[PDB]
Write an enzyme that holds these catalytic residues in place. Structure first.
Site, mmCIF file in Angstrom:
data_model
loop_
_atom_site.group_PDB
_atom_site.id
_atom_site.type_symbol
_atom_site.label_atom_id
_atom_site.label_comp_id
_atom_site.label_asym_id
_atom_site.label_seq_id
_atom_site.Cartn_x
_atom_site.Cartn_y
_atom_site.Cartn_z
ATOM 1 N N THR A 1 0.866 -1.098 0.030
ATOM 2 C CA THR A 1 0.009 0.083 -0.093
ATOM 3 C C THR A 1 0.909 1.394 -0.008
ATOM 4 O O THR A 1 2.163 1.062 0.373
ATOM 5 C CB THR A 1 -1.189 0.144 1.289
ATOM 6 O OG1 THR A 1 -1.737 -1.169 1.269
ATOM 7 C CG2 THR A 1 -1.851 1.261 1.214
ATOM 8 N N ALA B 1 -6.649 -5.981 3.869
ATOM 9 C CA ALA B 1 -7.794 -5.577 3.113
ATOM 10 C C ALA B 1 -9.147 -5.703 3.478
ATOM 11 O O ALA B 1 -10.096 -4.918 3.693
ATOM 12 C CB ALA B 1 -7.634 -6.389 1.740
HETATM 13 C C1 LIG Z 1 -6.030 -11.675 -1.695
HETATM 14 C C2 LIG Z 1 -5.534 -9.938 -1.839
HETATM 15 C C3 LIG Z 1 -5.986 -9.195 -2.725
HETATM 16 C C4 LIG Z 1 -5.713 -9.538 -0.099
HETATM 17 C C5 LIG Z 1 -4.815 -9.923 0.918
HETATM 18 N N1 LIG Z 1 -5.446 -11.185 1.533
HETATM 19 C C6 LIG Z 1 -4.427 -11.937 2.008
HETATM 20 O O1 LIG Z 1 -3.379 -12.156 1.820
HETATM 21 C C7 LIG Z 1 -4.889 -13.290 2.818
HETATM 22 C C8 LIG Z 1 -5.736 -12.940 3.931
HETATM 23 C C9 LIG Z 1 -5.914 -13.863 5.088
HETATM 24 C C10 LIG Z 1 -6.172 -13.635 6.516
HETATM 25 C C11 LIG Z 1 -6.094 -14.491 7.359
HETATM 26 C C12 LIG Z 1 -6.382 -14.283 8.754
HETATM 27 C C13 LIG Z 1 -6.244 -12.724 9.283
HETATM 28 C C14 LIG Z 1 -6.004 -11.924 8.321
HETATM 29 C C15 LIG Z 1 -6.091 -12.409 6.964
HETATM 30 N N2 LIG Z 1 -4.366 -14.366 2.538
HETATM 31 C C16 LIG Z 1 -4.630 -15.331 1.547
HETATM 32 O O2 LIG Z 1 -5.157 -15.002 0.680
HETATM 33 C C17 LIG Z 1 -3.428 -16.498 1.330
HETATM 34 N N3 LIG Z 1 -1.916 -16.233 1.958
HETATM 35 C C18 LIG Z 1 -1.460 -17.703 2.419
HETATM 36 C C19 LIG Z 1 -0.373 -17.717 2.279
HETATM 37 O O3 LIG Z 1 0.121 -16.598 1.584
HETATM 38 C C20 LIG Z 1 -0.027 -15.295 2.368
HETATM 39 C C21 LIG Z 1 -1.556 -15.211 2.067
HETATM 40 C C22 LIG Z 1 -4.541 -8.910 1.841
HETATM 41 O O4 LIG Z 1 -5.307 -8.580 2.477
HETATM 42 N N4 LIG Z 1 -3.247 -8.193 1.500
HETATM 43 C C23 LIG Z 1 -2.517 -6.918 2.286
HETATM 44 C C24 LIG Z 1 -1.370 -7.297 2.959
HETATM 45 C C25 LIG Z 1 -1.657 -8.090 4.150
HETATM 46 C C26 LIG Z 1 -2.069 -7.413 5.634
HETATM 47 C C27 LIG Z 1 -2.274 -8.122 6.519
HETATM 48 C C28 LIG Z 1 -2.471 -9.566 6.373
HETATM 49 C C29 LIG Z 1 -1.902 -10.030 4.950
HETATM 50 C C30 LIG Z 1 -1.794 -9.397 4.065
HETATM 51 C C31 LIG Z 1 -2.726 -5.621 1.182
HETATM 52 O O5 LIG Z 1 -2.579 -5.973 -0.088
HETATM 53 N N5 LIG Z 1 -2.695 -4.418 1.592
HETATM 54 C C32 LIG Z 1 -2.431 -3.262 0.900
HETATM 55 C C33 LIG Z 1 -3.672 -2.559 1.229
HETATM 56 C C34 LIG Z 1 -4.775 -3.003 1.387
HETATM 57 C C35 LIG Z 1 -6.212 -2.350 1.312
HETATM 58 C C36 LIG Z 1 -5.042 -4.267 0.088
HETATM 59 C C37 LIG Z 1 -1.108 -2.595 1.251
HETATM 60 O O6 LIG Z 1 -0.783 -3.020 2.414
HETATM 61 C C38 LIG Z 1 -0.178 -2.373 0.273
HETATM 62 C C39 LIG Z 1 -0.338 -3.199 -1.077
HETATM 63 C C40 LIG Z 1 1.114 -3.527 0.785
HETATM 64 O O7 LIG Z 1 0.842 -4.776 0.600
#
Ligand SMILES: CC(C)C[C@H](NC(=O)[C@H](CCc1ccccc1)NC(=O)CN1CCOCC1)C(=O)N[C@@H](Cc1ccccc1)C(=O)N[C@@H](CC(C)C)[C@@H](O)[C@H](C)CO
Ligand SMILES: *[C@](O)([C@H](C)CO)[C@H](CC(C)C)NC(=O)[C@H](Cc1ccccc1)NC(=O)[C@H](CC(C)C)NC(=O)[C@H](CCc1ccccc1)NC(=O)CN1CCOCC1
Lengths: 233, 243, 204, 213, 201, 199, 204, 199, 201
Positions: free
Chosen positions: E1, E49
């Site tokens: 992000t 997200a």
């Molecule tokens: C599928 C995508 C499009 C969404 C993604 N989701 C995910 O990554 C989900 C979350 C599952 C979860 C379980 C329990 C509790 C919480 C979350 N996980 C999975 O889908 C499966 N994975 C298993 C092995 O690899 C990693 C994840 C996500 O949220 N990504 C975040 C980063 C993150 C934060 C917290 C936990 C996990 C990941 C993100 O993009 N954040 C951006 C802003 C938002 C609004 C999208 C920013 O932070 C920028 C892009 C940097 O990443």
């Protein structure tokens, strides 16, 4: 208990001669004669395998030895030293193969074995080898014939001879032989140049021949030698 | 390894190998050095001028550090060894101790090395002698001399190698406070002393100088020819109008 | 993962009488990009290239030691090195560190210096060789690269179709990976010439 | 896994007088909640002028003791003289630090006479840190022994009191008293108290009795 | 992000990237990280997200109910405090969420930073996300309260861009909103690939 | 925590570092120098672990000087960089690894100005500009925003000022003063320390 | 250790027809001293004092809740509280938190409000009572205090000898502990009067 | 990391705090206020965990104000201090403990000026002067060295300046500006912010 | 422990407490924490007692051998570098040790801080130990290069005193040494109990 002499047994004379190497060559030029001929489509190694009694079993120890599937060896000089060098050469070849997964180029094996022989002219508490080696091979399409003497020096030969009467044999090959020959012809002139010294009824058990074409190296059977030693075939 | 006693005592109490090494030093090209007020000069004789040989690649004067330089006499290969080990030591001293290096210290190191080679199994004494020169902190200019035996001393001026006794006698009879009162005069003293044994030339003489807090400076054959011209002029303006 | 620390992507493709090798240009530490011109493909002689992906240090180190052994080889023997031979060499070099391996997965692409026969292989971090007739991939985005290659690659491609194919594969695979990209470089090598191009790519 | 250490208890005390030095210790060797023996003094006579007290892990105590003996002999053979007390202290420091990364689990207090005949104590930590003292305690009941001696021998926290030097008699009764008190509270201290007095005359050994619970 | 927001004379500028990752894998590049709470209230979105989306949506619901009940529009401070209070009850449970509540209030331009950790601070400029530092650099080097509108747009857009350049987890497309007194306006939505051509040559 | 920065111009290299030596919560030195003269035209900016920094840096330094004495000429900035990278990479999988991040600035008589970046993992990379430490996270983007390959040394110093001021603004660490030096055809030149009159 | 977080020392001694209770004055957090006038002894009525050592918070809290229950007791019943009764009260209060105990070890010293008979006891953190006829100690330097008390205490001490004894015990025990000290306060209580003194002590 | 300081005079209480709100490696706010008006003559300086600080502080504040509304008079600084200490101590062994360190400054019409110190473990202690945070480790000794029970408010401000300057000198954290207020018979008075013109 | 050293016009002032603890228990209050390496070289001592004592004693040995070999006195920089190099070979093995090497050199007054961690830095003033912060306070508030001798003594003594006041692991007696060009001199050794009476009333 034992350790070892750490000083060279081979040193320079005031004239500048490494005397022990020259004496080693004297040992070489005293053993059974061996000829080698490169022949466009193959290589031939031949040697006088004349034992000393009907009691000897000539089908137990061989003078024409394989290093790998494509490289062969004969020698002039001392048996045991040769045996040692054969084992070492085989080992070197296997190392090269393990590293590169490709059969070792004949020139390379020659160089390495030459380094091994060179060690014994400088390393402590040892004499040089009383052995000259003729090494045949088939690498990259072309055939190869090499010689390595006790000093660790090596030369590439079209054809040559070593051991007793190596000079007469060298002139013989220089005259009664040349390029464009086939493997058969080369074998013929090899047994012929061996006959120029073989004092006695040269049988199929009195001499040993090995060939090396682009199909690999192998030792000729006593039968094939019999066919060739019929002054024909 | 080679565990054999090479340097041993003789029935008369001599170390023959060391003496032989000293004789090897005697065959070396002459190498003299003098110590002045604000300068120190080292010059080497018979450089074996072949005129087909690169002069740079055969210099008998080498710098050990920014503080210390050194000339030698004897077996050049051995000298290369000793010189490199000395340089390495000069750096190691800076590594273990923040301060640089004193001339006395590196001299002591070289000497100790040579001696160690006079008393070790399987080895053989270095066939070199060395004139070490430097300006250690406190400003005091110093010159030392080493020996294959391992002995080392300090000198006001000295000479080693081919014809060393002659130049030693000359320097003895010529080292005054009047001489080496100026930099050019000290350099001229070195050139004269060298000319008193060299095969009369100037293209056979390599001279270098260290001064104050500056770097080592080697003299070009032009400047050497100039100083030799002034020396040949002072030998005809104070030795021709009186003889 | 240790491999993911620097990121990166390396791919090689086979052609008619030509061969191709491409790699991204990003040098980054975890999430931050430090350089955009990082070399991951090194020439091991005329018409023979190697491409290392993984931990940057081991990329450079393996490349350097490999050049060491290679130079010694081409000196001892009076010839250029064969592709298979180079592969076995790399395999040996990597396996020497079986229990303390370099973290890089090399990809070799070239033409037989005697013949011209195209050649592509890849290796483990411990030096297990794998030769293919189509493509080989190694990097943090290996799955994406596999995805593109399995759908774009055709057998007998000319030096122009091969370029387009490997370029689209690299670009579109890399664009779905966060730690691979910041530019793509492609070497298309043939008997007569070597053509090096840097593609127009995303820089985010 | 496996622990190369076990705490065997024991308390130790040394007092330095003008012409004497007292080194005392309990005689209880214990392990866990059990008594190994009631006849195990922690005092070791090194030289006519020097006595050592070692408490803690009995294995390291024995070992360190025998080592000190051997090295005393070595020094004697090397310099044709006996080790002075301070010298033994320094040597002990080096010996203790030699195991800096696998320490002897031993609290050491050296009591004796210096080269001027005066008394001297040297207190040690398990890895060689030592200092000279007039009086020091170590071992399990150390924290029970120290504060009283700070008061009675050091005259600390006492207003308008006289600084009369410690006599051998008063020192002796002080030792007996602090050990008797320690036997009440420390469970590792008891059975018997051995006291070693070191004067120009030599080394006396006395043995008071402590409770057996 | 890589979201950022700053208030100047002519309102509150809000900007963000659109990348969404699942590990090193880029799951999306078309994510609207600026939630439209009210026609006068915006909420940036960084971190988890689902967490951000759910909680800010719930925030929007709550603000709507407030608007109906009190017959007036909720203040920026009250919205941010509402979200902060909702989130605080889940502190330590692992909600990853860092948002900015921006709008125009009876006290003029309002900007608040609200954490899943429990932070809630008003301020002039703010940058939240993995690439927040990179954005902070250029934004701070180019910020002024007396910035003209197009200048502010350029500053925000460029800051997010450079952020996407350095941060491996930031990219996609720079989205830009402007919050004025009569409500917010969707300024721009330029892809990074195009902005590269614009900014470099 | 320490901060390094390098900016390469067309004919010069500008380098700067913080002057803080800190332990625990206190600054123990306000005039610490993170730069090491290795050649007359080569500077080594080393940063990181306690003893590892000075040990490694001085080792490399004395080895370069040893090269100079042995050969009569100095190592090129590139040869130097690959030397240090070789040493650091060799100790990586050894018993005694050096946790050091570094920059190498230099000027060659042939290749001109050069700046090098090195990970503690010994990954060497050439760059027009680089930075080490947490402060880098706040400054690099700025360097992206304003750097041009033809930037003059005056403009480069001004850019450096922008960076350091940004550190004064956003960074939570103190870092009041900075060592600043430049390298060109005339060797290493010490510049006025960029400092901010806090207290 | 949790007890060692704040440090401190509390002691009580018996006399002829008098009783004594003392405590150090340092309020510190681990190794830093915050206050030099921290109260650790609280009056639970005329001629009845309690002294709490341990975690400062639980010292204050236990003191306060105890005063709560005490006040309610002396209101419901038309009398002052007996020492034994107060002891049982504290025991109950502490044991109510058997599985989440306050980290303080209380020491009660007083005279029977009806008689005058001296009384000293101490308790666990979970409220196990222990009555003695000589002394009771609680704190980080309990071993030192035991050391002094076992050697200084005599049976029938007058209000002057008791003071000197408990003072020397406290001072010299505390002076061998790093987290106890910064002054010592002593309350010597008798039938007629209560005498409170702060001793001259080390402040390091 | 945050810094609080209180110095009690004969008829006044001088309090000061840092103005930094920081997260990770960046300062996110340069005008953060750590003080909470609870009465017309009571200030609460709270510091520590993320949400715990503001939550707890505001809870206490609104409860004090509730007391004022319910009873027509304000709580004394002492009653306030013991109220907050009771609340903090009650939550200590609960499911939701507040990790907060605090100072309480006040003026009573009867008891005069008062300063209170509170651990996160809810240990309440009155003091002539106190401080919270790492900065305390560098300032308390100074306060020991120069404080006198009869110190005038001018001299107290000067002493505070000595402390803050010491923070500028030794502390590794930034902390450029400080909120400063005083409390007496006329209530709470805001003073000029002690700041150091860094950048 | 709590030692401090600073160099001014008239040499190098060195001061220390004398407390030695084994946990909360005070094992000693009569520890000489200022080791006399040479008649011109002093070494403060903080951290692991045995470590400091052993290594600084070994340092003294090494400096003596240096003095005999080079026929001159070792420099402060060389001594500090020697100790630093010796200690560095044991990095990570758990040596707790923080010392100051003070003296008079050919470069005048010299003061170095040497860590078991690997630090080695020259500086004007230094304070090492558990109570180093408290000492730093007053020392910094009272330091000047133009301090007169007795003033410097007062500053050092007072700093160590206040340190002992706040730091629970510092106390005993303030020891004070002065390093001048003709060597060091043992200035004072005042007990803290007395200094309390002196400084308070
Ligand atoms: C599928 C995508 C499009 C969404 C993604 N989701 C995910 O990554 C989900 C979350 C599952 C979860 C379980 C329990 C509790 C919480 C979350 N996980 C999975 O889908 C499966 N994975 C298993 C092995 O690899 C990693 C994840 C996500 O949220 N990504 C975040 C980063 C993150 C934060 C917290 C936990 C996990 C990941 C993100 O993009 N954040 C951006 C802003 C938002 C609004 C999208 C920013 O932070 C920028 C892009 C940097 O990443
Ligand atoms: C200093 O730091 C000030 C006082 C603050 O503590 C002083 C300075 C010096 C020169 C005296 N240092 C100490 O007092 C030091 C604290 C410390 C200990 C361990 C590591 C780091 C710092 N005290 C000691 O070193 C101490 C000496 C006493 C004066 C006897 N020795 C010990 O504490 C023994 C263990 C040291 C050690 C053992 C194994 C490996 C490495 C080091 N302590 C014991 O034997 C008993 N005990 C066991 C349980 O409680 C703690 C120690």
């Amino acid at each position: 208990a034992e350790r070892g002499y750490s000083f060279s047994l081979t040193t320079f004379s005031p004239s500048g001669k490494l005397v022990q190497i020259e004496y080693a060559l004297a040992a070489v030029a005293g053993g059974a004669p061996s000829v080698g001929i490169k022949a466009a489509n193959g290589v031939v190694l031949a040697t006088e395998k004349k034992q000393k009694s009907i009691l000897y079993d000539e089908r137990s120890v061989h003078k024409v030895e394989p290093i790998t599937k494509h490289i062969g060896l004969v020698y002039s000089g001392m048996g045991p030293d040769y045996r040692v060098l054969v084992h070492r050469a085989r080992k070197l070849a296997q190392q090269y193969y393990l590293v590169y997964q490709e059969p070792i180029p004949t020139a390379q094996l020659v160089q390495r074995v030459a380094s091994v022989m060179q060690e014994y002219t400088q390393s402590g508490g040892v004499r040089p080898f009383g052995v000259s080696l003729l090494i045949c091979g088939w690498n990259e399409g072309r055939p190869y014939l090499f010689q390595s003497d006790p000093s660790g020096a090596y030369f590439a030969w079209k054809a040559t001879a070593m051991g007793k009467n190596y000079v007469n044999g060298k002139t013989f090959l220089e005259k009664r032989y040349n390029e464009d020959l086939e493997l058969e012809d080369a074998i013929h002139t090899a047994i012929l140049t061996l006959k120029e010294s073989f004092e006695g009824q040269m049988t199929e058990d009195n001499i040993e021949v090995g060939i090396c074409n682009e199909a690999g190296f192998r030792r000729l059977t006593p039968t094939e030698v019999k066919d060739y030693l019929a002054a024909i075939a | 390894s080679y565990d054999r006693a090479i340097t041993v005592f003789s029935p008369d109490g001599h170390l023959f190998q060391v003496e032989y090494a000293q004789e090897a030093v005697k065959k070396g090209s002459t190498a003299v050095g003098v110590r002045g007020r604000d300068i120190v000069v080292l010059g080497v004789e018979k450089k074996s001028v072949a005129k087909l040989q690169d002069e740079r690649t055969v210099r008998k004067i080498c710098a050990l550090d920014d503080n210390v330089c050194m000339a030698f006499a004897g077996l050049t290969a051995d000298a290369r060894i000793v010189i490199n080990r000395a340089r390495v030591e000069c750096q190691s001293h800076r590594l273990t101790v923040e301060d640089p290096v004193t001339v006395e210290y590196i001299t002591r190191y070289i000497a100790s090395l040579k001696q160690r080679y006079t008393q070790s199994n399987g080895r053989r004494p270095f066939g070199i002698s060395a004139l070490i020169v430097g300006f250690d902190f406190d400003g005091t200019p110093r010159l030392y001399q080493t020996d294959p035996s391992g002995t080392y001393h300090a000198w006001k001026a000295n000479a080693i190698g081919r014809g060393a006794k002659s130049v030693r006698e000359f320097l003895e009879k010529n080292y005054t406070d009047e001489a080496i009162e100026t930099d050019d005069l000290t350099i001229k003293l070195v050139i004269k002393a060298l000319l008193e044994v060299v095969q009369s030339g100037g293209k056979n003489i390599e001279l270098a100088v260290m001064r104050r807090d500056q770097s080592l400076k080697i003299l070009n054959p032009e400047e050497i020819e100039k100083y030799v011209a002034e020396i040949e002029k002072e030998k005809e303006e104070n030795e021709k109008k009186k003889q | 993962s240790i491999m993911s620390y620097n990121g990166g992507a390396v791919m090689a493709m086979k052609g008619k009488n030509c061969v191709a090798i491409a790699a991204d240009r990003r040098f980054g530490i975890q999430a931050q990009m430090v350089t955009t011109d990082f070399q991951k493909i090194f020439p091991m002689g005329d018409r023979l290239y190697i491409g290392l992906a993984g931990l940057a240090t081991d990329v450079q180190t393996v490349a350097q030691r490999l050049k060491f052994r290679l130079n010694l080889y081409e000196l001892k023997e009076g010839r250029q090195i064969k592709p298979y031979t180079l592969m076995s060499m790399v395999a040996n070099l990597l396996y020497e560190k079986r229990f303390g391996p370099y973290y890089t997965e090399p990809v070799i692409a070239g033409l037989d210096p005697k013949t011209f026969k195209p050649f592509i292989c890849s290796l483990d971090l411990i030096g297990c060789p794998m030769v293919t007739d189509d493509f080989v991939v190694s990097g943090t985005c290996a799955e994406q690269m596999y995805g593109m290659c399995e759908s774009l690659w055709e057998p007998n491609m000319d030096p122009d179709h091969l370029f387009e194919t490997i370029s689209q594969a690299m670009l579109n695979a890399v664009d779905r990976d966060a730690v691979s990209g910041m530019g793509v470089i492609v070497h298309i090598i043939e008997k007569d010439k070597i053509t090096t191009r840097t593609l127009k790519a995303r820089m985010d | 896994r496996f622990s190369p250490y076990v705490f065997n208890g024991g308390t130790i005390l040394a007092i330095a007088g003008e012409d004497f030095a007292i080194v005392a210790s309990d005689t209880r060797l214990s392990e866990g909640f059990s008594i190994h023996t009631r006849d195990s003094p922690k005092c070791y006579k090194l030289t006519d002028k020097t006595v050592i007290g070692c408490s803690g892990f009995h294995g390291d105590c024995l070992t360190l003791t025998k080592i000190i003996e051997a090295r005393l002999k070595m020094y004697k053979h090397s310099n044709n003289k006996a080790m002075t007390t301070g010298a033994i202290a320094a040597m002990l420091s080096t010996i203790l630090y030699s195991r800096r990364f696998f320490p002897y689990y031993v609290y050491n207090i050296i009591g004796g006479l210096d080269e001027e005949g005066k008394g001297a104590v040297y207190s040690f930590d398990p890895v060689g840190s030592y200092q000279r003292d007039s009086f020091k305690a170590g071992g399990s009941a150390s924290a029970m022994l120290q504060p009283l001696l700070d008061n009675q021998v050091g005259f600390k926290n006492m207003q308008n009191v006289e600084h009369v030097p410690l006599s051998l008699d008063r020192a002796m009764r002080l030792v007996k008293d602090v050990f008797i008190s320690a036997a009440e509270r420390d469970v590792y201290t008891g059975d018997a108290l051995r006291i070693c007095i070191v004067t120009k005359e030599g080394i006396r050994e006395e043995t008071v009795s402590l409770r057996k619970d | 992000t890589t979201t950022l927001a700053f208030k100047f004379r002519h309102g509150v500028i809000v900007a963000a990237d659109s990348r969404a990752t699942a590990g090193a894998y880029i799951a999306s590049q078309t994510v609207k990280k600026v939630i439209e709470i009210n026609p006068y209230l915006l909420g940036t979105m960084a971190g988890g997200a689902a967490d951000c989306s759910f909680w800010e949506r719930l925030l929007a619901r709550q603000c709507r109910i407030y608007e109906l009940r009190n017959k007036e529009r909720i203040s920026v401070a009250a919205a941010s405090k509402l979200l902060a209070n909702m989130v605080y009850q889940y502190k330590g449970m692992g909600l990853s969420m860092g948002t900015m509540i921006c709008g125009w209030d009876k006290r003029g331009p309002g900007l608040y930073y609200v954490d899943s950790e429990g932070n809630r601070i008003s301020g002039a400029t703010f940058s939240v996300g993995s690439g927040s530092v990179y954005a902070y650099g250029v934004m701070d080097r180019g910020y002024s309260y007396d910035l003209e509108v197009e200048q502010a747009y350029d500053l925000a857009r460029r800051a997010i861009y450079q952020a996407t350049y350095r941060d491996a987890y930031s990219g996609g497309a720079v989205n830009l909103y402007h919050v004025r007194e009569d409500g917010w306006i969707r300024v721009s939505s330029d892809n990074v690939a195009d902005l590269h051509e614009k900014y470099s040559g | 925590m320490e901060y390094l920065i390098g900016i390469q111009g067309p004919d010069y290299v500008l380098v700067a570092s913080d002057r803080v030596a800190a332990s625990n919560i206190v600054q123990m030195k306000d005039d610490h120098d993170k730069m090491f003269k290795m050649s007359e035209k080569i500077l080594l900016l080393c940063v990181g672990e306690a003893g590892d920094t000075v040990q490694f840096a001085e080792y490399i330094q004395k080895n370069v000087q040893l090269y100079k004495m042995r050969n009569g000429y100095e190592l090129s900035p590139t040869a130097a960089a690959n030397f240090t990278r070789r040493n650091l990479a060799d100790c990586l999988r050894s018993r005694t690894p050096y946790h050091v991040n570094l920059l190498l600035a230099g000027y060659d008589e042939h290749e001109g100005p050069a700046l090098y970046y090195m990970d503690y993992l010994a990954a060497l990379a050439k760059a027009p500009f680089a930075a080490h430490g947490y402060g880098a996270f706040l400054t690099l983007s700025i360097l992206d925003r304003y750097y041009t390959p033809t930037i003059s040394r005056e403009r480069a110093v001004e850019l450096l000022r922008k960076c350091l001021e940004e550190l004064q603004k956003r960074f939570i660490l103190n870092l009041p003063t900075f060592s600043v030096r430049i390298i060109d055809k005339n060797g290493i030149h010490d510049l006025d320390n960029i400092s901010f009159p806090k207290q």
